């Protein structure tokens, strides 16, 4: 809808102009949905935040266990377009609560999701996100989840997970990013960039027609939108030699209201992209 193409020199200077950044950010509509789109008894138990709801045109619908029941088919999640408008590249969702853990795994299974990206600090667990993976092994709703290995790196922990239901078995990579900064300054950008690059490479290893990548922290809009926006813009930078963070933010919000929730998040994405542009200039 809106658009501000940035070439390299404008990108680095823009990252350093908080006044222009807030002027631009606070012109972008949030595109939140009216809670009356979802007048469904008991729905509020499936939502972590009662006012942050999935926009109806792009929402994910669970067809298990009862497609004919709007409560059991509801999950707070939206399909997100990727670079170039590609459909269903990501799913942005809230961090599961106790009552929607099983719903989350049903979504993973139904969508064939190969990658989950979680952006929740250790100090924030079981407040901003229920721990929804086992130590070893659990089953929800006929899907056996088994954590086959844990790889601790500086910026994140990667869990290789097996999913079995009946005579089917699938792999899953769970990236748990633990380096989200309270201070969104440039010296905190690199970990997020490496996380983006690592996931791009993992996604490419899945081959053609990759299934949706799930991204969440808590509400599925703020940090989630930052991760997705950076991923989209890294591709745009490599392919077009420019970034359009404003357009990308608008695209995100068209898919899920509220993506990139604060001005400090928006400036952070500019810092990350400024960093990447420099790297790419060797």
From Swiss-Prot:
The Gene Ontology terms for molecular function here are: phosphotyrosine residue binding; protein kinase binding; protein tyrosine phosphatase activity
List, from the UniProt record, the residues annotated as the active site of this protein. 217 (phosphocysteine intermediate)
**Keywords in alphabetical order:** Endoplasmic reticulum, Hydrolase, Membrane, Phosphoprotein, Protein phosphatase, Transmembrane, Transmembrane helix
Q: Which residues hold substrate? A: 182, 217-223, 261
Q: Which domain of life is it from?
A: Eukaryota
GO cellular component: a single term? endoplasmic reticulum membrane
One GO biological process this protein is involved in is: signal transduction
What is the protein's major site of localization? Answer: endoplasmic reticulum
Q: Where in the cell is it found?
A: Endoplasmic reticulum membrane
Span of domain Tyrosine-protein phosphatase:
21-276
Known function: May regulate the activity of several effector molecules involved in synaptic plasticity and neuronal cell survival, including MAPKs, Src family kinases and NMDA receptors.
Task: Give the record's family classification.
Answer: Belongs to the protein-tyrosine phosphatase family. Non-receptor class subfamily.
Q: What is this protein called?
A: Tyrosine-protein phosphatase non-receptor type 5
Q: Which organism is it from?
A: Homo sapiens
Please specify the portion of the entire protein covered by the chain, as first and last position out of its full length: 280 to 561 of 565
């Amino acid at each position: 809808s809106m658009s501000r193409v940035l070439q390299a020199e404008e990108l680095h200077e823009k990252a350093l102009d908080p006044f222009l950044l807030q002027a631009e950010f606070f012109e972008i509509p949030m595109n939140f949905v009216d809670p009356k789109e979802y007048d469904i008894p008991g729905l509020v138990r499936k939502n972590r935040y009662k006012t942050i709801l999935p926009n109806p045109h792009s929402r994910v619908c669970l067809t298990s266990p009862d497609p004919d029941d709007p409560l059991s088919s509801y999950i707070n999640a939206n399909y997100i377009r990727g670079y170039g408008g590609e459909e269903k590249v990501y799913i942005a969702t809230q961090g599961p609560i106790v009552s929607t853990v099983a719903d989350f795994w049903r979504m993973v299974w139904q969508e064939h999701t190969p990658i989950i990206v979680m952006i929740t600090n250790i100090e924030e667990m079981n407040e901003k996100c229920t721990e929804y993976w086992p130590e070893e092994q659990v089953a929800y709703d006929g899907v056996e989840i088994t954590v086959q290995k844990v790889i601790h790196t500086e910026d994140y922990r990667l869990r290789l997970i097996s999913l079995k239901s009946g005579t089917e078995e699938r792999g899953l990579k769970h990236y748990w990013f633990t380096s989200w900064p309270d201070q969104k300054t440039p010296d905190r950008a690199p970990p997020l960039l490496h996380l983006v690059r690592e996931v791009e490479e993992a996604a490419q290893q899945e081959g053609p027609h990759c299934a949706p990548i799930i991204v969440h922290c808590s509400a599925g809009i703020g940090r989630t939108g930052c991760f997705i926006a950076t991923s989209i813009c890294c591709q745009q930078l490599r392919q077009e030699g420019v970034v359009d963070i404003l357009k990308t933010t608008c695209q995100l919000r068209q898919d899920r209201g509220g993506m990139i929730q604060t001005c400090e998040q928006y400036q952070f994405v500019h810092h990350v992209m400024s960093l990447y542009e420099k790297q790419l200039s060797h």
